[PDB]
Amino acid sequence: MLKYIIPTIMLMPLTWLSKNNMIWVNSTAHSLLISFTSLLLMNQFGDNSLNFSLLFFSDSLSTPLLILTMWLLPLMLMASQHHLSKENLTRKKLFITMLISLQLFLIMTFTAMELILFYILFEATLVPTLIIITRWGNQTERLNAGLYFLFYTLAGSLPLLVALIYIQNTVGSLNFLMLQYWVQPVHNSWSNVFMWLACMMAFMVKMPLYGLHLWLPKAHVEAPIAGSMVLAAVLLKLGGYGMLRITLILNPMTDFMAYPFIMLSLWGMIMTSSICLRQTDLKSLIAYSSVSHMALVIVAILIQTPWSYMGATALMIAHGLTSSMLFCLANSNYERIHSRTMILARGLQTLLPLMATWWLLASLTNLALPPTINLIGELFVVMSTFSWSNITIILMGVNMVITALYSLYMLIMTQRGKYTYHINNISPSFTRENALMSLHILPLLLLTLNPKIILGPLY
Amino acid sequence: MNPIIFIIILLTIMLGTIIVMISSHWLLVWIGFEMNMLAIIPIMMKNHNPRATEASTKYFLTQSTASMLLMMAVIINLMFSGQWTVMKLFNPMASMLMTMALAMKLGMAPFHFWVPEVTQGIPLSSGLILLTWQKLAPMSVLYQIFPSINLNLILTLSVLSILIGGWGGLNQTQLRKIMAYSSIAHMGWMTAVLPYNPTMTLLNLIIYIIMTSTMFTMFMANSTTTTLSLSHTWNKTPIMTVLILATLLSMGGLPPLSGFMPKWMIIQEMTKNNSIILPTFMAITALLNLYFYMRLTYSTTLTMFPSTNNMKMKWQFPLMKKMTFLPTMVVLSTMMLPLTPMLSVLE
Amino acid sequence: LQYGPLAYILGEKATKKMTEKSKLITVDGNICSGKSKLAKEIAEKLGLKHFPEAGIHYVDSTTGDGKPLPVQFSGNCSLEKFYDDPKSNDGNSYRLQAWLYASRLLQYADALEHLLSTGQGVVLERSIYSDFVFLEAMYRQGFIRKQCVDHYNQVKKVTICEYLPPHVVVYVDVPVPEVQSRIQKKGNPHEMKITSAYLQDIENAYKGTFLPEMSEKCEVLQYSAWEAQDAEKVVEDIEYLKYDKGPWLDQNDRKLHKLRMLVQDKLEVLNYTSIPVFLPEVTVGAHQSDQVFQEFTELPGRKYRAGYNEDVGDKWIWLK
Amino acid sequence: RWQEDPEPEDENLYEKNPDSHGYDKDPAVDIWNMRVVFFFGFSIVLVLGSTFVAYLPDYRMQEWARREAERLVKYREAHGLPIMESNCFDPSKIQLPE
């Protein structure tokens, strides 16, 4: 992985040694070049994962997440450089450094072969993320949002640290390849019930699981746009990726420990979808949309079927691009009217016709219009949960209906109707804003032509 | 104080600590503590004000009481073994008295009350010695007597210190009282792992000293002793706010910083011995320390607090403080996690 | 060696450089009372260093290239604005007074550093010991709130305690009616707006509080307007003073060393002039503070420590 | 209250630069920023990356598995053997308990 780790680090010298007026051009261009080379990770085999060294390996699960992560860095740079224009030069370079360091921790997190190396990097992403939210957020509440984000995560992570170290003691290793062959079954006992909880609660909080999700709408509403992009696109998927790996050693206890969390997700997804119908804040609506989508991922990981794992892998990638696009779309409105109130600026399709096309495409992927990968992921999950229990189609069906209602409600309220009279600073969409939107939707729609590369190890 | 007298007194503080660490005889261990206590008091009183007088008095009464319990243990040990060698003790009553005696010297809870008050009442340079160098001698004794220490007693002190340190720092606006309660909280981790692996007690001790020295040096560089006074630092020296942020996140134990290393190695040793509940309880309770570290980072680095007009005069003068070793200490405080396997040097 | 404990141990002790002629002298009086001229002549005759009364731009004169800085780098405090509109809503009156005290505190530290390190006495025009008379005049005329006075006293009580009072306090007693005529002759249009009641308040503070206090600890000389017109007669009085009272008798190398470590460290001197007490008159918002601080570092020779600014010709940066 | 700077007005990048792409205030930097985003983003990553992905060699051996299965079915049906046996492992190599 050094062909990706090292050039990612070299982005830091590049940013700091760039001319004062070229920090965005240089960092954006060279982070796109790194994104290009990440496609070499798709040298995947039918039987064996791609194991580079004792430290790093890349299978079909981590490969698409790595490519999503490295694609997101250039997009985040494009999305931030407007609202950071008045920033002090050094504080602009420190902002970019926080994003580069986040990418560094992320690509190492997704390829760590040892679970305790995964834990440290998994935890290391907190610091740059927290600093972005609290230093470069705009509102007073960004400070409270930082604390909720920090302490929700740590409340779960610290038990996970104890469980992993206990697992290394008893099994002798935490290398994920070794665990595949040395895994022993988990037999019922209160001791194992809490080993199971410690291994899964840290990841449940990151997804987040319904009930434990309150940190997420706070963080999104306060984060800067680049922070919201990485939060929704990648950092949520650290929970999913971690769960997909650790469940290997939790069998067969996962048979009955899953029930309380499937119930929370199946019911929680209807509850958070319905919350979206009455949200007044556009960013908060998108945040609650992520909770509903990630509920499906939690259910799919817990029912442990080949179809559900394929569906979860596609959902994580599809959600990553769609939710990131939606936050970017809402941000472009915010940079004009400087409010997140959804009902404030209406009828924008009249004033920004092409940006209204992006709003349409983003909404269609969010409601999972076939054959988007949003629909492929969501459909595969629904097929597998139906076999788990037929009655789940009722809850899946209702969520699909409510998901369409709030997706098109967001489209209709902001883009259609009459424009707000007194709002007269809706300038024409910039090239930067249109290119940012297209760099989200075009790769998302292109992946429909070749969806096998985002279906994960069980394809 | 004459500069030569200050150096002689400082070297006597170190000589007393050294004597404790090299002595094979309980009498010379006791002499080392007494010599150390004699020399430090004038450093506390160096500024001669009522708060320094109160601080030194409270310190003297506590340390002098601990020494009497320390010598009582030594004499009881002599009755029941007829020797003076510094090692395990041969009487459980002697072990308890010595263990309590060292707990009061360290300021562990519930013998902790003096630490916040004494630290607040003395300058920053003296506070640095109190919360760092003064831990060496009592810990070096615990390192040698642990095979005879009562496990329930030592783990009780460790648990209470982590709780009281964490809770005590939540209500503090004075930096010296924040460091004091942080020191109490960190003392608990060192003694919690002592029964299982003394090597991890040294690691925590060394890393705690580096981070604590870094913070005190940065507070001294700006002559700041309160939260609000420290909140002006972004307007004087922006770089120092970033070092404080990195150091404070490290003291909170956040990966990938160095301060995570001791919490990580202590949890490993405890789990190897089938101690699961205690490390879990300890790690969660350490979130209290992270909370009031995070408040300081907010008021210091991650926001910009109101300034005063006179602050503009300071822009025109450079930092004159010595800030000895601060560049090295801050890097060690933050960027040492990749070298964790180097802990075997302490074995 | 830069001064420090090592230099002191090796023989840099103040008692070696101080003589009977190493004296700190302060000339005080009302506005337009002839202080400057008398102070300059005393300094020239006795062989002392003359410090012109500390103004807004005193600190500028001791740093950088010595020129005044733009007024935004002093808070925009204006003496002219004080005379025109002494009740300005923007708190200019107290902001100026707080700034002036800090400038005097710095000048006093510089003066003490000169006296201790070379043994040459100095002459000052007013000082931190007499600056309060202007604060009392402002408060008695309603130009500042009582809160401003409380703030001023807090800053003074934790700063003036650290220093020794001047050896000699020269005072020129010019009565107010003559002062008003003197201002009218001087010709500064803003200064003509001074009310006589304000001038009387300056005189009441000087006679009421300052001189009775200084008498206990300093040699005080009071000269009418005409006596002050011949500095040679003033110098004659200074040359025959007893010097039998005050704290300077109690000083020794051990104490003057500690005093010298303070005054040479200017940030340490100015530590408490920016206590986190949020008065509207002296509090600055973060956005204003950040912008001005950034502009300050963009000034010539101000980005780096003195001697490391290549924009103004500093050399050997890579070896310094 | 305090001495604070008022909230600055909104800068419309189009006023000074009607041809602004929204990247930078400097028109020359603004053009270059647009060029690198479009060339490296669309022309390289999206166009070449899409072409690279389309021609990936037998991603996860799905084609080989289909060719191999054809070989086995041809053989087994010719020789009269079952297309696929229920037992994955030869039962002679297994030793059941009891």
Partner: peptide
């Protein structure tokens, strides 16, 4: 608007004897 930063009311939360 512009980014919020602590004002005097916010700063006084940390100026008391205790939190």
């Amino acid at each position: 608007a512009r980014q919020w930063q602590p004002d005097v009311e916010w700063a006084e939360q940390y100026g008391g004897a205790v939190m």
